[PDB]
Ligand binder design. Structure first.
Ligand SMILES: O=C(CO)N[C@@H]([C@@H](O)[C@H](O)[C@H](O)CO)[C@@H](O)CC(=O)C(=O)O
Ligand SMILES: O=C(CO)N[C@@H]([C@@H](O)[C@H](O)[C@H](O)CO)[C@@H](O)CC(=O)C(=O)O
Ligand SMILES: O=C(CO)N[C@@H]([C@@H](O)[C@H](O)[C@H](O)CO)[C@@H](O)CC(=O)C(=O)O
Ligand SMILES: O=C(CO)N[C@@H]([C@@H](O)[C@H](O)[C@H](O)CO)[C@@H](O)CC(=O)C(=O)O
Lengths: 293, 293, 293, 293
């Protein structure tokens, strides 16, 4: 398998005003991430891709386009999970047929699934697809917390590579590295990249890398090299940008910052707010002038 | 329009071992609720229907079968909500064409939608379908809390009838009746039916009414009649049953109790546990003998 | 032992601007509750008494004054709990010597005590004082949740009489009445008095009964009588008042409403806001005119 | 003022079986921290000192003994906060008279204090004592969350030096350093020392430094020097020890580990479990052999 370490943008998708995928803009976002953000890979179909608001056919179309555009130039991870295991299997087979390097799956949500249910969900997608699997943990959205011993159970399936860790529990993080030193962790919070990197995460997956992937890689590499003073300066500027993005509307503002570099990054999909008001456009432009010029 | 007050079973769905819908079993469930449980209506496609684990086609087939079977004998509400607004619109159109008496929609979940996004979601479904709408509030699963003022904003759409209140905040409940006296509330927690009835809810939507509809009606009517001593005895026996069902696995145990009365209620849908372990099958038989014999 | 059923005001305390106790005002509060509010008893030293902001000497002086004033006319319960078990013991001894009819104690808070630590705390107070004990449950402030089985363990001490249930879990409440039919429950949320009464609570302990004791008795007795239409009207007016008091500052506004009836209810104790801002003084006068005139 | 940067043990207190302070053992704990753990300073009266279970007289006695034993050899910070502002002022004057280098105060808890109330509490202790003030933030115990802008308001009082940050929000941490670069942060979670240090905290306050202060200082210094690989090894061993301590009972196990080096660290104070069972003694000894031999 391709090396799955380093910087992965969580791929945003270009939507038309009616909510349909804009293929031309999606291809532009892919190309911008490869050529300009110089990412190691793309995480496709995650929360950033507005995935959970889309139909099965739409998720396939995104997987097909992203893989057609990226070809073999970078690593590609397909997030196929949802509350629907039969959909996760179907998407998982599809992305596997398309040559995606690993699958990833959000812990099933909404219903209060027991841990054995959650494990069986992972084991079923793996068995049905035969592909690698990255557990996607995002407690602040799912309300699901997985402990060290529970991760170990998940890791008994030798196709589980590790965890996309969109959590802030740095004690849990350190304990997962100690217990399962050969399993990978990708840090999911961009605004906490430096401290996650200081504990030896193997890479990161983030929304803001679609526009700030140059700083993200510096923070990651500089931390790993022990150049903490410099990584901290770059985290500080990054977090001024991120604080601004979050204040303005995270997905719409990253898209606006893409548009300001000529990427037809499109609308967001309803029920998210579909377009930035003119005041927030002006705000995004200030962020561009201050941080990305 | 049909009277939507009174006792609504939240319809359970009969699944095959492979997760496909068993139509024969699903019709037996609908018939049993109408003929034996004597419900006023069915709430179709909600959390009890295992709706969120299903594909769009499957949710349509369920709406079709339930309406095929029940025809015009009882009231029918279609829960069409989800994270996917375009799916909610499609399902609302379909259910509206089938002649469902109102739609209902879960507050959109997973992402942290703002209240104006949540309102637009309701107003969009309504506008696209032309049908009545019941707001579906289940904070314990969605993490969405709507205040009295926010319900007022929702209720400015005159096709919003009120709320399926799967919530235990009885201060909120009394305040909604005070502020919006002409808007309906259906209580969603069967184990707190009596106190909710004491505050003048217009009916109730419940998973356990599929097997305990006789008692539930009694609690409701005895409470509305001011016969609280008797209502309370029956709530106590009902809650001995409910406590048993919760410890044994909520939806599986309701299904097993149906099966024990000859209703082919089938399996649950993965990634919920698909069948009861053997000792839990036996526990279910003991609840049948103690409470539903 | 005195009958401890019925309506208990949670006693407010009159403070001077410097935070010292105003005895004259505190006696006026006790008299007003007995003579005008017609309470069955007072719950002295609980959260409404601003007890947790006070020194040991101050908590004794309050117990002394309240018992001095009320003598034997009404029932008297002393809340002596805290994080400090040795203080709870000292206060329980003192209150027991004064002739308080039962002690009560808050679950110990701040630290995350285990259930066996929590049980030992109750059993220690009981053993040292020889007096009856009411468990004081207020999860919204302490973060401590006690299950039915845990209450059973507490109730194995035969001097535990039941629970001051400042909690909204009406499933839990019905289950406690089912499992421990001879143990008492006092409802703690005044704004949900009616549904709690519908489940057979033995009385209620309330901050707002210091000014709204006439209505509260009515809701309680009308509900116990099965006259729910009338109980509900009075709960609605009571909750218009309570909503006003909460928005305006709970304890200050109850004190201002006392003051407006000539009861010198004094200041609140820092670090609570010591006095109402001027516009809030005026808001309190408008609640008086609307609801307590 | 003495330099307040670096490693501060949160001082444990030796109690007798009856709950009284054992002065001889308290002096031994102080001396062990100065001479053997080589701490920069002691944080006296915090959660680790079992402070919130003690009387005012007892808190004074601890302050008096700790200061008499330490003299001027290290920095000393006195945690004087509680729900009782008048007690916090009294303790604050006392510790100030004794020559404590700064005061610190927990955000007032139990009651849901507003932010202006919290700020006035800090401003009152400062004004009454004239001493420096370190805000003590421990959300997981108090339930109080203070945002960046709210910290800025607190910092408008030029005697506030910064924050003892017993929180895990490393985004908040990074933002406080960016907004208030001259204000100090002490990290409060020992098991997350390395990532807190990687963001430039100025020191740490922790329970486990009373026994692991040699490793703690290596992790802190090595991180600051950019020797991340080595600091991570030492954090890994430290966290094996800490995981064990927490599993066994945190305060009793640190005390047991002190006893195994000849410190008469005493009992814990009720309502905490007062003594370790013989199995947990044996467990502590294994921790000693594995990590502290
Ligand atoms: O909640 C989110 C927003 O998508 N998490 C993302 C994080 O980058 C935040 O956006 C960022 O740190 C600001 O909070 C990230 O983990 C991307 C992702 O997980 C996905 O596409 O599934
Ligand atoms: O979460 C649930 C279980 O589906 N809520 C249901 C409730 O009956 C509980 O099962 C019951 O009180 C046991 O706790 C109910 O409100 C039905 C419903 O909401 C739906 O199907 O959408
Ligand atoms: O938290 C409170 C306010 O002290 N609880 C009180 C309640 O009356 C509320 O104030 C009321 O329902 C408004 O929400 C009450 O249970 C009295 C009490 O517990 C005590 O003093 O210990
Ligand atoms: O909750 C605690 C336990 O006292 N926090 C302490 C932390 O060291 C933990 O004990 C440690 O990281 C393990 O969780 C620490 O911040 C000491 C302290 O704050 C105080 O004395 O007030």
């Amino acid at each position: 398998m391709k090396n799955l370490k380093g910087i992965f943008s969580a791929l945003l998708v270009s939507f038309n005003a009616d909510g349909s995928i804009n293929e031309k803009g999606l291809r532009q976002i892919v190309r911008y991430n490869i050529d300009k953000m110089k990412v190691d890979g793309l995480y496709v179909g995650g929360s950033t891709g507005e995935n959970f608001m889309l139909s099965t056919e739409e998720k396939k179309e995104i997987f097909r386009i992203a893989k057609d555009e990226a070809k073999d130039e970078i690593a590609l991870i397909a997030q196929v999970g949802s509350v629907n295991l039969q959909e996760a299997i179907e998407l998982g087979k599809y992305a596997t047929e398309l040559g995606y390097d690993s699958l990833s799956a959000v812990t099933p949500f909404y219903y209060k699934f027991s841990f054995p249910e959650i494990k069986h969900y992972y084991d079923s997608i793996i068995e049905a697809t035969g592909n690698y699997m990255i557990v996607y943990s995002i407690p602040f959205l799912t309300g699901v917390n997985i402990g060290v011993e529970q991760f170990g159970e998940l890791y008994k399936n030798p196709k589980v590579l590790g965890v996309a860790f969109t959590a802030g529990d740095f004690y849990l993080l350190e304990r997962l590295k100690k217990a399962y030193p050969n399993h990978l962790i990708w840090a999911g919070f961009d605004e906490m990249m430096l401290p996650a990197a200081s504990l030896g995460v193997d890479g990161a997956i983030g929304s803001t890398f679609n526009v700030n992937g140059v700083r993200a890689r510096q923070i990651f590499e500089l931390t790993q090299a022990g150049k903490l003073k410099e990584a901290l300066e770059i985290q500080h500027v990054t977090n001024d940008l991120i604080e601004g993005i979050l204040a303005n509307g995270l997905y719409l503002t990253i898209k606006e910052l893409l548009k300001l570099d000529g990427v037809e990054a499109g609308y967001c999909r309803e029920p998210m707010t579909k377009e930035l008001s003119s005041e927030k456009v002006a705000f995004a432009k200030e962020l561009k002038a201050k941080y990305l010029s």
